[PDB]
Paper text:
We validate the specificity of the motifs through applying qPISA to another member of the DPP-IV family, C. elegans DPF-3, an orthologue of human DPP8/9, which reveals a related but distinct cleavage motif.
To relate the observed differences in substrate specificities of DPF-3 and DPP4 to structure, we determined the structure of DPF-3 to an effective resolution of 2.6 Å by single particle cryogenic Electron Microscopy (cryo-EM). The map was interpretable for residues 37–123, 259–431, and 470–916. DPF-3 superposes with the apo structures of its orthologues DPP8 and DPP9 with r.m.s.d. Instead, the divergent enzymatic footprints appear best explained by differences in the S2 and S1’ subsites. Another significant difference from DPP4 is the presence of an isoleucine (I705) in the S1’ subsite of DPF-3 that is oriented towards the P1’ substrate position. In DPP4, the corresponding side chain is a serine (S552), which is retracted from the substrate along with a segment of the loop.
Residue numbers in the entry:
A (entry chain B), B (entry chain A): 34 to 123, 257 to 434, 465 to 918
Write the structure that this text describes.
Amino acid sequence: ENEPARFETRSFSQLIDHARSWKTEVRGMTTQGFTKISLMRAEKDRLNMYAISSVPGTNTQSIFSVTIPLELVEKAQVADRKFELKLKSGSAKVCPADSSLLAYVLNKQVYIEKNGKIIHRTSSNSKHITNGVPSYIVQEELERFEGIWWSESKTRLLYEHVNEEKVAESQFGVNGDPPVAPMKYPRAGTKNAYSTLRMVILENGKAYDVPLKDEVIYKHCPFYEYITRAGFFSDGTTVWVQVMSRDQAQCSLLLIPYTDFLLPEELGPPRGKLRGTVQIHKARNDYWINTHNAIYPLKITDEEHPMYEFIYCLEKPNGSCLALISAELDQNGYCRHTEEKLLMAENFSINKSMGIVVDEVRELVYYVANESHPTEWNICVSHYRTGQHAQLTESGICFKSERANGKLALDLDHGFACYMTSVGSPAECRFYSFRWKENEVLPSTVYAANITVSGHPGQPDLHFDSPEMIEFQSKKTGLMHYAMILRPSNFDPYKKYPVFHYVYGGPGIQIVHNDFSWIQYIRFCRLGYVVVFIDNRGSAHRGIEFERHIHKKMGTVEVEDQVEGLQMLAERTGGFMDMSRVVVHGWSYGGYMALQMIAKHPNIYRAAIAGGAVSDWRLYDTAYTERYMGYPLEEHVYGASSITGLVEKLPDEPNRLMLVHGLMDENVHFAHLTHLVDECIKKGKWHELVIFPNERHGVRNNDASIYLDARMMYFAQQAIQG
Amino acid sequence: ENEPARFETRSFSQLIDHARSWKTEVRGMTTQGFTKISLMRAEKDRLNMYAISSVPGTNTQSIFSVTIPLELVEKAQVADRKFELKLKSGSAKVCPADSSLLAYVLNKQVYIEKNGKIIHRTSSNSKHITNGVPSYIVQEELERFEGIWWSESKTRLLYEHVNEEKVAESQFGVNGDPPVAPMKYPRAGTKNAYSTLRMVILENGKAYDVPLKDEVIYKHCPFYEYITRAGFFSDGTTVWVQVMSRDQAQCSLLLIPYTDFLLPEELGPPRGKLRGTVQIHKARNDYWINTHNAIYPLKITDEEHPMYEFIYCLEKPNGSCLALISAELDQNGYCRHTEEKLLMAENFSINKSMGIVVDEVRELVYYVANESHPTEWNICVSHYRTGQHAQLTESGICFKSERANGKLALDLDHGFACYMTSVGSPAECRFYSFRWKENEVLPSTVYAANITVSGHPGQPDLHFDSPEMIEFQSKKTGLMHYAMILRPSNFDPYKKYPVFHYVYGGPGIQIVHNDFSWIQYIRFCRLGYVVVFIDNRGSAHRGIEFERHIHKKMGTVEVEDQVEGLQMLAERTGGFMDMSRVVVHGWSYGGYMALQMIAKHPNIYRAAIAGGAVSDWRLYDTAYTERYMGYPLEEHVYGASSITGLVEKLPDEPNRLMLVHGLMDENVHFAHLTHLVDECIKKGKWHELVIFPNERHGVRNNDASIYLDARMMYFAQQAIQG
């Protein structure tokens, strides 16, 4: 038994001041950092770190650098005092083969420039025909942010062609105002943009613009819908692409020679060579194959026997593994065999949003993976010829990526610089120095230095109740789950507090994580709330067996995991969580589930706040919806997972349901809200509605953000205080 | 002193059932009626009434008729038992001059048909160029619903030309959905559609399509913006138009001869004749001139001296009067003089939304006017040569018009059929029979019969507390005002009840009126509310002196009249109205004022419900906004009357402000709401928002209507019950 904690109520105007003061304070918990890290060897004996940061006193961006004192860093082979390095100030690529050549995308067209002069450009007769920029769905869901690639050895460029002409329109704006250009947005069951690759060949300043032959991909890939990845093979002689089926259940990697481009005539065991375009890997799942950036062509050892070898990723029931994938062709160019050599244990996943760094002098590949723990990223190295494996960072400390399709700032001989974070500590940038041994394959590392940007304030001394990181087993499935509790500012172990249950629950995202992202929720803990995060089946970085349970069953499985996880935490917490005062909140997919949970479990959740909620999957985009819901679109599958069928089950009482939505939200459209609101009207269900006419998917304006917080918080008080 | 009445609270679900049951009952207070009334003399000795009604058992429309037993009616010269007549079943015009000719507007183009065959049509190369249909602003604000006219004597047709190409666009739809054709909507300070008239001349089946010479109007009317009225003059020889300035402060009537049309060359005191187009009347106002349908050309008595004479309306400080307007031209065609002969006392207004019926055999004009009372319409007759005047309907009973630009179903010799209504009684259609006397000019009438449609249920026996119709004088202006109170279902004179104050307050509309339109508010009185209606300065049918006070001052004057009127009623009611529990509601302009009143008088109004509110006049249309706000648009005038400047004054506490709006509202655009919501977000002001994604200006869907009522009522309880 526990005593109900007093819950302190307050005025809306006081919630505004709370949210406003808080934003001033939350920014004081961090320092100016840098948005990119890279290392270069300017000289054989010097290593220089570069990063992008603001100029002190302003928000203007510039490139900063520091010299790494390698003679001194090399001596930090023990856990000695760490050195500080101070960094100082002072869409386009330069071809590695030629420093005078640049290529970039300007106004969604590809340009090639020499010494400041444009020598070649692509053109289109329509805004819906694009070059150098990935198709919207590809950039948005399949996470490719570039359409431009250079060969390393030679002055040749590869780029993407996009055709949006049959893509369905979406209007944005405010009713009664003048029309603006429509957005092109694919929907489930609708046609997507058409894609193909092209090349520009530069011969002594003479550009040629040559398309790929149209059936080169299709002929080998009968199910082809998307190009998910592309780039040059070694020595710049060949182009590979990774392609997928519409539902992303099938994936193939195919290697395309120069002769399979539509060149002008002026430019053109018994194992064989790359006779023509061929698949060098194929994979199929029962549910889906996820995209990743762990693709890297290896240099061929034998030109007579140009064994096809690359670093790739294979999905497994458990984890997502790096593998050395290799293949043999017949004399006639088709594959006779693939090997699928795993470089790691299946029990953990790689970070698919990260690229990899591959050595050739030594056969070492460096990558980010969940080696130590499901909630933590580590930097690891493996030898791709042996399968020998080691972890280069400490367990309990998480590697942080600042961007999708991120990179490690790794110097193959000396070490690397990166951000590391943990649940009890803000991200910090540190340098790990390599140590090499005789008669050994893998390096070891030592933490030798920190990097800070000069001219800025140092790190604040922060004081808080560290989040309780909890692992527990499901009582229904036997699966391990992770959850986290953020403690209220003034905590009494023998009192119970109102529950704020934050959910996302959708695929591709992990909420419970070993980082410092939980800081933003201190604002609720200062109001006497317990904030609980739980992951679930369908959640990212566990493996397909864990994710697959939501296949054609969205809103049916992950909602139960959230409910059971909450109840188990209530037992483990010693009963300081009050189950009679529970409010559930989420955004995007989380808004969808906040609706699902109150509709299905009105006796657990007193109220729900659903922001950016997806009411109908048929109104959402193609690549996301169909990999989970299947294809061809099935009316009864999509109907079962919609909110439409749950409107009847929504609470009859007022102040139990709140809907929050942007008017300009291009991700989850306002149409989803209007559908939900219209159903509520028909069914006689009460709802509170908050709209932000000038906001997108999230709320970015500082005052709009304050307002939103004040209303979520005010609403929550009324929901519980009864 | 008075005892607070218990206020009975209830659940949202109970408010839904109340509103739902009510709609079933409110329809039971009425019967099937008919949407048009007309009389014809099929034979010299027979008068036949025709009307449009549904076929019993269904909603299918058809034409019904009854023969009037004239001899029986003629003998009903006393207040005898009245007779019932039972009516039985069984965009285009037929030319009065020729029964074989028809003309109509189809798909917004003008067609002329003979014996079922099209002989002539207009055409356009764009959807924005229209013929036969009044321009949107003209149809919407200046109340003209037709662009097609026939000559009475001859086979000639007149029609309107509309050019919308420079009119600003307005997008409607749901964000994320495909674009639909933009609406053309003028805004204050923006360009309107261009208009001109054209003719089709039919000579033995040979059509000619002839434009008006472009400067015919402009040359005589330098301020010309709109054509507000048009039609043929007597004998079909000439065309007159009524035109206005952009701010509608100036108005002219000009008479245009056949020779001022471009024509094919084959067709084209010392007082004179219609030498050419000339103004025959001009009027100017310091504020504005209102439009009306009281224009009628009179037959000229002397062809040698074709005195220009017509029935017209002159605005006065008090009232809107019929006048016989006449003019003389010089020999050279320009006016030397106008007479302005008033046919009525200035103390009352004509019904400007009604047309008039004019006799020539006797110089009698029949019209609807506020002869007996400011809240009541009467049918009146006057002799246009003498000014002799009489009232043909009983005082205390109001004439009802079923439509804008309505007509009297008047037979000049026998009498008329019309709907009459009163505050204590549902509209009924009755026949008034004329009585003529020797050596007398005006007819008298007797109420002889009622007309009902056969096959339908008779009138219900209704029981209610009749509305208290109140007149009182302002303590600040000395002006007379009218107000009405609807009593709560179970009324205790010594108890006080919560106040529901309904407002419109805008120009062109009268809320307090002697009719049965108050029935819809019984639904609030059954919940224990007192419903109070008050008119104000700026309100319709009093005269320009009464209306002009809101000139360039919208939201500044009419709000005070509503506040003072409420307080005076509280005194006159004996204190049964509770001033500590006041909720104000209105729609459209009323929504605007509901915001104005709480922002300005938070100590009187506990809460406001603003539906369809206009937050910014610059977002509203040209013809309406500029006649009140002036032209050229002034930033500080429009700023002063906007809600933007009042957002700061809106209540800080929650549940005090509610905003209701349609998403597809083409009258008051959603942009008005998004502007208001955005300001609230910036200022930190709480609001409740209800949106109807599939509704227009009002809410028409039966379930959407039930839902809206339930939320307005639920909200009101929470606002007062504290």
